[PDB]
Design a protein around this ligand. Sequence first.
Ligand SMILES: CC(=O)N1CCC[C@H]1C(=O)N[C@@H]1COC(=O)c2cccc(-c3cccc4nonc34)c2CSC[C@H](C(=O)N(C)C)NC1=O
Ligand SMILES: [Cl-]
Length: 285
Amino acid sequence: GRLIYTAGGYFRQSLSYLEAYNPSDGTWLRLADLQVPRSGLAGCVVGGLLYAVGGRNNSPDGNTDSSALDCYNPMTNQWSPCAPMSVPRNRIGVGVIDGHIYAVGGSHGCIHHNSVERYEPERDEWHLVAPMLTRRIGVGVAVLNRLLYAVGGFDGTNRLNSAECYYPERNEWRMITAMNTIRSGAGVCVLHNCIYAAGGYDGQDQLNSVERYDVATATWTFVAPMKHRRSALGITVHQGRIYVLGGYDGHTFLDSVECYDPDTDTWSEVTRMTSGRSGVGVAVT
Ligand SMILES: CC(=O)N1CCC[C@H]1C(=O)N[C@@H]1COC(=O)c2cccc(-c3cccc4nonc34)c2CSC[C@H](C(=O)N(C)C)NC1=O
Ligand SMILES: [Cl-]
């Protein structure tokens, strides 16, 4: 029994929602709210615990970038604060290698980070690792072959189609083949040994196109596009399928949840979130 969790997001302001979707029966669970609202955060799971990393709290009274790391226990329905990151990281990308959380890029006011840091739950400590070759906010992150890939994003001046790879044993970054499309705020995940980059923003329009990276051929190829154009979407993999949750299409905050079946190369709307939102953190446990 595994659930798709969605934490935070944005609709008029940053949200505290923590909701879980059960793909087997189509039900939505309303769980304990985040202590501090956040959009542009990322979610991940380590040892059956859900983590909400970074983001920013946008309120009609003012905005605050977050360096926070919070931990949710599904068995207790409780959030617990963890050690914060060295810097606030809004529009962050996160990846897990060997139970260690990597917080990648993101922004803090006028600063677009290339810095990357790693959290060890067993010690409750963050330590900086080698920074990326490019500053990246709205970066998609995927873990494949025990390497951490940072895909697309925005460097402060340009929207990116470039992507790079981190080798944890060597503590170094290398540029890989660039995507066909410039994407900032895309959903990046790994399914069947491929990295998928779905949606995002190319500097002019929100995208519905989806491309996947094959490591053996080192090429990015387009697969079937989503029904809705979306940036700042949440993304996850559950039982061999890709799930995209919410986002922003340029005017509307989507409640649509689409599901990609790699066998048929088709997307279908499987459910709707309880309300439309963008910039959510998503994870499965
Ligand atoms: C104009 C503007 O940016 N806004 C003014 C008030 C604050 C702020 C505001 O509305 N943000 C909320 C939240 O959204 C996210 O959390 C969020 C999270 C993760 C990634 C991204 C993202 C998408 C596309 C390219 C990106 N390159 O880097 N990150 C990218 C976003 C922003 S989606 C764009 C939409 C917007 O511009 N509106 C006007 C509503 N923004 C949002 O939905
Ligand atoms: Cl924002």
